[PDB]
C-alpha cells in the first residue's frame, strides 16, 4: 500500500537478497528505470522486474515511511550480523538521482544521513548504493560509440591531450531526464558497473553532523572555504572498486549544493552582486548592446534565460530585472542597471507595488553601466561554464566597489547580510587617493592598506534621504522627521528611517495597541517618493505621550511614540572569488580587499590591448597595400579563392586569422600569439567594393596613424609609478562620476 | 476601515457629490493614482485628495463589500431621486483599469454588470465613470509632445495619411503600469477630459445578461461571429460627449475578453493549433532556422517569450513546449513539432512525467516541418501585430489539414473540443484526389464539395494502437486487449484504449468497489510505450465475473469488468481565421473548408514567385555586367560612394533595392513594385573582392539561367487545369508524407 511502489517478482521471499529496490528522485526517473528494467529481449543479461524494484523518494516523513515499509527496515534493531540482514524484503536500495546539485548532494546526502542516523551498519555493510550515470559524452563524427566520463575532471583531463575538439560534440548529462532513448539502453547494458556502494569511514561520522543537523558555527567554518573537486587518484580508487566513501560525497556534493544556496542570497564583495543578478547584468550588456531600445520586462527575461542559461524561472527573473531597475528612496541600488521606463514600485510598498512585466518596459543605463563596468575589460573576467557553454562571469570588477555602494539585505537563511550604502565622496576619496600618485594622502594610504590604519572615512549615504544619521557608541541611527500642530491635534511625519516602507509602517503603529490608545486616524496622504503621514491624537493625549515614552537622550518622546529610529546593523558578509564565504569587520576591509582585483585587471587590460594593436597594425597596413595594389593585383583574372591566395603569397602578404584580429574576444595574449598570424587572405578577399574607394582609404591610413599613437601611448601607460595603468584608472573614475552626477539630475532616466 | 482605501478629505461631508471614487486594479494602479493625486503644486488645478479617494479593486464578495461600504450603498433601495442619490458619500465612482483584455472587459464588465444588477438607476445617471488613458502615443524627433489615440482605429486611420514613420516612435501602453513619469503629469494636467461616464442603453439590459450569467446557449450565438471594432463615427460620438454607451463597451471589449480565453484552448480549424501554440511553431522554425542545434527547454522557452510575444510565464510555455515534442502511443501529437532529446513523458502518466526544463533538450523536426509548412509561403501570411510588433502568423495554412490528424482534448471547458485523429492514408486519397487531376476521383469529388457528399472515407487513425476500432451506431469505439491465464489466475492486459493513461486506468479499476471484491492485487510490469498489467483474481472469482457482467454484444464480460472500451466522441468546435467559433458536423467539412485556403495560397505564392524571380534577374544581371567590367569602371580612382554612384549612373547601371530583392520579407507584390526599382547602388558597392574571380562569376552566370528558366517555369504553373499550382501541391504532398513515413520509421527522431 505504497505509492509509487513497484515491486519485484522476488521480493521478500526466497531470493529477497538478489533483489534491489531503485530509489528514484521522481515520476521522470522512475519512466526511466521502467523503460531500463523492461528492454527484454534486447537486454537479456540486464536488471528487469525480477530482483529489482522501484520506490519514488517524492520518521514523520511519509515517503521515508514508505522506503522502510518495503524494506522491512525494523528502527530498533541494529543490523550488525548477516543473519539479522536477512530479513530485509530487499538485497539492497540504490538511490537514482540526478548529478547536479539538487540531486546527489541533497537528496541523496539526506537519504545517507538517514541511514547513517538510524542503521550505520546499513552502510558500512553495503546495503546503500547509487547509481552513477556518465555524466559527460563526448561524441565524434565517423563514431558511433562516445566517450563517457563519470567527473568533470575525468573530462578536463582527457581534453588536454586531445589538441582538437573541432570534430567532437560534449553533452552534459546532469539530470537522469537528459539521457536519450540510445543512451538509456547503453547504461543498462552494463547495469551492473554503474552499480556503486557508499562505503562509512572515520571522517563521515562528524561530517554527517556537520552537514545534518547539530549547531552552527561547525558547518559555518566549513562553508568559508569553497568545494574543493576530487583529485584524479580518488576518482581512480572509486572506479577500481566501486565504493564510494561516504567523507568524499558530502565535502564535494553536499558541500557544493550548500554553497550554490548561499551564493544564491550572498553576493560576491567585488560587484556586491549574486549569481542570478549577474547573469541580468551579463545578459543586460549583450542584449542592448546593438542599440539601447527599450524591452518589455518578460521580453527581456526570455533573453535572459536564452543567452545566461537563467533556469531559475520567470517569476523569480521577472522580480530580478524589476529590482536591477527600481529607483526611489529606500531602494536596494542607488545606482540601478536599468532604466525603468514604467512604474517599477514605490518607496510605500517597498518595491513591491511594480506593475506586471507584460506592460512594464526596461532599458539598459548604458552611460552608467559602460563606464562602471568597462566592456574592454570584460572579455579578461573568468567566466561561468554551465554545460559547457560560456556563461555570466564569475564576477565582475567595478571601476567602484559595488559591494560598498548600495543598500543589500538577506532573509535570514544563513549568514545576515545587511549592508548600508557609504557616501559617494567618501568611496571617491578614498579609490583617488590610492590611485592619484599627486594625492596629498597616497602615501599615507598606501601604508595603511598593510597596516589596516583606515586613515580616511567611509561614512553612510544620506543621499534620498531627509532625515538625520547620528552615531551613538558603535552604531549609525537613521531618524525621521515629524511636525506637531498644537491647535488641530495632529502629528504630521515628513519623513520615515531610511529603509522603512510606508505601508509596513503604518501597520506596526496600528498592531501596536500602547501607542493606539492615543490615537484613532491615520491617513497616508504622502505622495510618490515623499512622506507626509496623518496622526490624529485623542483630544487630550498629547500630554500623556511624553510622560509615557520619557525622552530618552538619544530618542525623543515622539520619535519615542512613532517609531521614528531604526539602527543600521551591517553584516559585511561575502562570496569570496574562488568560493565561500568571508567575513569583513569594517567597509573599509571590503574596498581595501576590492582594490588589488581592480589594479591587476588594469595591468592586464593594457598588456592584451598592446598585443592586439599590434595586430591590427599588421593587418591593416596590408589592406592599404592591397588598395593601392588593387590595380594591378586585378583578382577578376583568377579563376578562384585559392589561385588568388597563391598570388596574394607570391607579393609578399601576410596569411592572418582575420576573425580572430577584428574580435580576440576571450583570448589570452599567448593563445592570440599563436593563432593570428596563422591564417589565410580573408581580410583581402571579403573587402567591399566600397573599401577601394580614395576617401575609404584615406580613412583607414589615418586609423592606422592613430593604432601606432596609441600603441605608444600604451607602452608609457604600462611604465606607471604607482601602478601600470593608474592615469587610465583615475580618468574612468571621473567619468563614472559625470556618469552618476547626470543620472541623479535626472531620476536615473539620463533622458 | 477598509483595506487599501484612501479616503478623499471632503468624502461623506457637505461637499461629497463633489468627492469621486477611483477604483484601481490594483497596487501599480494605486501607485501610479497617487502620483497623479498629489503633484501638488506642478498642477495646481489637477485632482487632489480633496475630493477624491482611492480603493482597490484587488454580496459574498469581500471587496465588493468595501465599495458598498465606503460608497454608503444600499441594496434595497433605488436611487431614482436626486435627493436619495445625495445621501453615498461620494459623487462618482470612475474605474481605473488597464486598457486591455484583463482590464476593461473582464474587471470594468464585471463591474458594470453588478451595478447595473443592484443599481441600474446610478448607471443612468451616470454615478458610474471610467478613466480613458490614451492607448497609443507617437513620438516624432524633435517634438516633444506625442500623437495621442485612445483607439486603435484612429491611430490606422492616422497613419494612412502619413508620408512615413521612419521619423516616428509608436508606443502601445496597454495597461496603467506602462505610463512613464512625465505621461502620467502630462495626463493629470488634462484629467478631467479624460474622464468618461457610462450610460445605460436598451441594447444593454439583454447584453448585460448574455455576457454574465443568463446560463448559455444565448452567448454561444454571440461568440460564434467575432469583434466587430468601433467605427469612426462611433468613436467620434464618444469623443464628442464623453459618455460610453454600455452596449459599445460590452460588444468590443468585453466581448474580445471572452474569445480570447477561447481561442487559448480551442484551435484554429486551418492549422489545429492554439495562439499559444502557433508562437512556438514561428519561434521554433526561426530558433532552429540558421542551425538546427539541440536547446534546452527553458533556453528554447526564452527565445519564444523574447521572440514572439509570450507574456503567460514560462510554467504554461515549457508545458506547452514539452507537449510539442512527446511522441508515445496515445500522445497529442501523432506528428510533433519537435523532436524530443530526453524523456519528454510516456503514456502510463499521459505526458506528466516529463523531466525538468532545465535538463530537457529540444530539437525542430526539419525534415517535417519544411514539408508541412513550407517556409516561401509563411511570409504570405496575414500577422498577428502585439503592441504594433509582428508575432506568430495569425494562421497557418499546411499541406495537410492538422486539425484532422492529431488529437484534440481541451481538459477546462470550452465548448467540449475533441478531435480524434483520421487515417492518413484517407486524408492523403482525399487531398490526392482534390488536387490530381488524373486522379480517377477528381471530378466526383469536386461535385461533391458543393453538394457535400463525402464521397470518400476519413477513417479513425489506428497507428499506436494495438486495439480494434468498432462502430456501432453512429460512434467508433477503442477496444484494448486481455490475455486470461486459466492455470494461475491471472488475466494480463496487453492493451489499453485509445487514449486511456496507464496510471489513471489502474486508479479506476481500484476506485471500483465492485470489481475490487474479484481480484487482490494489480501489478504494472508495462513497459514504456507498451501495455503489460497482471491482474490478479480471487481463487474462485473467475465464473462469478462472467455472470456479472451480461456479455454485451458490443463489450465482452473481461472487457466490461476491466474497463477496456471507450467511445470516440468528437465535439469539432474550432475558431474562424477571422475570430469568432465555427462548429463542423463531421470530420470531412473540415477538410472541405481548409481545401480553398491552401488552393488559393499556392496561388499568391507563385505571383508573388514570379515578381522577385524577375527583380532577382535584373539584379543579378547588373552585378554580372560590373564584374565584367570592373577593371575598367576601376572604382579605385573615385572619392567616395556619391562620386562612384554616379559613375555607375552614367554607365546605365540600374539603381535598385538592394535588400528589398535579397530579402522581400513580407512585401507584397504592389509594395515590392514601387520599392524595388527605387534604390542606391549598393548591390555594386558592397561585392567583396571573392566575388569578381571567374569561377565567381561563372556561378552567377549560371544562376541567371536558372531563374530564367524558373521564370518560365512558374509562367506555366500558373495556367493549370484544375488551378494554379496544383502540380506543386502535388509534389509537396509526396515530400510530406516521405518526412511523416521516415519519422515514423525512426521514433520521430530522424536519425
Not at 529606500?330 to 506593475?355: C, E, M, T
Not at 588594469?602 to 598588456?607: D, F, P, V
Not at 588568388?644 to 582575420?658: K, Q, V, Y
Not at 596613424?705 to 584608472?729: C, I, T, Y
Request: with cysteine; hydrophobic share 35%.
Amino acid at each position: 500500500d505504497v505509492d509509487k511502489y513497484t515491486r519485484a517478482r522476488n521480493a521478500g521471499g526466497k531470493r529477497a537478497q538478489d533483489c534491489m529496490l531503485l530509489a528514484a528522485e521522481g515520476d521522470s526517473a522512475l519512466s526511466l528505470l521502467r523503460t531500463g528494467l523492461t528492454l527484454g529481449k534486447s537486454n537479456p543479461s540486464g536488471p528487469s522486474f525480477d530482483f529489482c524494484g522501484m520506490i519514488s523518494l517524492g520518521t514523520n516523513n511519509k515517503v521515508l515511511q514508505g522506503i522502510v515499509q518495503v524494506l522491512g527496515l525494523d528502527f530498533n534493531c541494529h543490523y550488525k550480523t548477516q543473519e539479522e540482514r536477512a530479513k530485509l524484503r530487499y538485497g539492497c536500495i540504490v538511490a537514482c538521482v540526478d548529478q547536479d546539485l539538487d540531486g546527489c548532494g541533497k537528496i541523496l546526502g539526506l537519504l545517507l544521513a538517514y541511514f547513517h542516523l538510524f542503521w550505520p551498519q546499513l552502510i558500512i555493510h553495503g546495503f546503500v548504493k547509487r547509481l552513477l550515470t556518465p555524466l559527460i559524452r563526448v561524441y565524434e563524427k565517423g563514431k558511433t560509440m562516445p566517450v563517457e566520463f563519470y567527473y568533470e575532471q575525468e573530462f578536463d583531463a582527457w581534453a588536454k591531450k586531445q589538441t582538437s575538439l573541432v570534430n567532437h560534440t560534449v553533452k552534459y548529462y546532469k539530470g537522469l531526464a537528459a539521457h536519450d532513448t540510445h543512451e538509456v539502453k547503453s547504461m543498462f547494458k552494463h547495469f551492473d558497473n554503474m552499480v556503486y556502494t557508499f562505503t562509512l569511514d572515520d571522517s563521515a561520522k562528524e561530517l554527517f553532523h556537520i552537514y545534518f543537523g547539530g549547531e552552527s558555527e561547525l558547518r559555518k567554518r566549513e562553508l568559508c572555504t569553497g568545494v574543493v573537486p576530487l583529485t584524479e587518484t580518488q576518482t581512480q580508487s572509486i572506479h577500481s572498486v566501486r565504493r564510494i566513501p561516504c567523507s568524499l560525497h558530502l565535502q564535494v556534493d553536499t558541500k557544493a549544493y550548500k554553497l550554490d544556496a548561499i551564493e544564491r542570497q550572498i553576493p560576491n564583495f567585488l560587484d556586491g552582486m549574486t549569481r542570478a543578478r549577474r547573469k541580468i547584468l551579463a545578459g543586460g550588456v549583450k542584449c542592448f548592446a546593438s542599440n539601447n531600445r527599450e524591452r518589455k520586462v518578460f521580453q527581456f527575461g526570455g533573453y535572459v534565460a536564452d543567452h545566461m542559461f537563467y533556469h531559475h524561472g520567470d517569476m523569480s527573473l521577472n522580480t530580478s530585472i524589476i529590482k536591477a531597475a527600481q529607483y526611489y528612496p529606500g531602494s536596494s541600488h542607488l545606482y540601478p542597471v536599468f532604466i525603468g521606463i514604467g512604474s517599477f514600485g514605490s518607496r510605500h510598498l517597498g518595491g513591491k507595488d511594480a506593475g506586471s512585466p507584460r506592460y512594464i518596459s526596461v532599458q539598459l543605463a548604458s552611460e552608467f553601466i559602460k563606464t562602471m563596468f568597462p566592456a574592454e575589460d570584460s572579455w579578461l573576467l573568468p567566466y561561468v561554464f554551465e554545460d559547457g557553454q560560456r556563461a555570466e562571469p564569475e564576477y565582475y570588477v567595478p571601476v567602484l566597489p559595488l559591494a560598498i555602494m548600495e543598500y543589500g539585505a538577506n532573509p535570514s537563511e544563513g549568514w545576515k547580510y545587511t549592508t548600508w550604502a557609504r557616501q559617494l565622496e567618501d568611496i571617491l576619496a578614498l579609490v583617488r587617493a590610492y590611485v592619484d600618485k599627486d594625492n596629498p594622502k597616497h602615501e599615507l594610504l598606501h601604508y595603511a592598506i598593510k597596516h589596516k590604519i583606515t586613515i580616511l572615512p567611509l561614512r553612510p549615504s544620506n543621499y534620498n534621504f531627509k532625515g538625520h544619521l547620528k552615531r551613538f557608541g558603535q552604531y549609525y541611527y537613521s531618524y525621521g522627521t515629524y511636525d506637531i500642530s498644537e491647535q488641530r491635534n495632529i502629528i504630521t511625519i515628513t519623513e520615515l528611517p531610511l529603509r522603512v516602507p510606508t505601508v509596513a509602517y503604518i501597520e506596526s503603529i496600528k498592531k501596536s495597541s500602547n501607542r493606539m490608545t492615543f490615537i484613532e486616524e491615520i491617513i497616508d496622504y504622502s505622495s510618490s517618493e515623499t512622506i507626509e503621514i496623518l496622526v490624529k491624537l485623542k483630544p487630550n493625549s498629547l500630554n500623556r505621550i511624553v510622560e509615557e515614552f520619557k525622552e530618552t537622550e538619544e530618542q525623543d518622546s515622539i520619535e519615542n511614540f512613532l517609531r521614528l529610529r531604526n539602527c543600521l546593523h551591517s553584516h559585511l558578509n561575502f562570496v569570496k572569488p574562488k568560493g565561500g564565504i568571508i567575513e569583513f569587520n569594517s567597509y573599509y576591509e571590503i574596498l581595501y580587499a576590492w582594490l588589488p582585483y581592480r589594479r591587476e585587471l588594469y595591468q592586464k587590460r593594457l598588456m592584451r590591448e598592446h598585443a592586439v594593436l599590434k595586430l591590427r597594425i599588421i593587418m591593416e597596413t596590408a589592406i592599404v597595400r592591397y588598395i593601392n595594389e588593387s590595380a594591378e593585383l586585378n583578382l577578376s583574372h583568377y579563376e578562384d579563392e585559392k589561385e588568388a591566395s597563391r598570388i596574394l603569397s607570391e607579393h609578399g602578404f601576410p596569411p592572418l586569422n582575420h576573425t580572430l584580429i577584428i574580435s580576440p574576444e576571450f583570448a589570452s595574449i599567448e593563445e592570440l600569439n599563436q593563432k593570428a598570424l596563422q591564417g589565410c587572405y580573408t581580410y583581402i578577399l571579403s573587402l567591399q567594393a566600397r573599401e577601394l574607394l580614395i576617401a575609404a582609404k584615406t580613412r583607414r591610413v589615418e586609423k592606422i596613424k592613430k593604432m601606432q599613437a596609441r600603441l605608444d601611448k600604451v607602452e608609457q601607460l604600462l611604465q606607471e609609478s604607482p601602478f601600470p595603468g593608474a592615469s587610465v584608472w583615475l580618468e574612468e573614475i571621473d567619468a563614472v562620476e559625470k556618469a552618476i552626477i547626470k543620472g541623479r539630475n535626472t531620476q536615473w532616466k539620463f533622458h
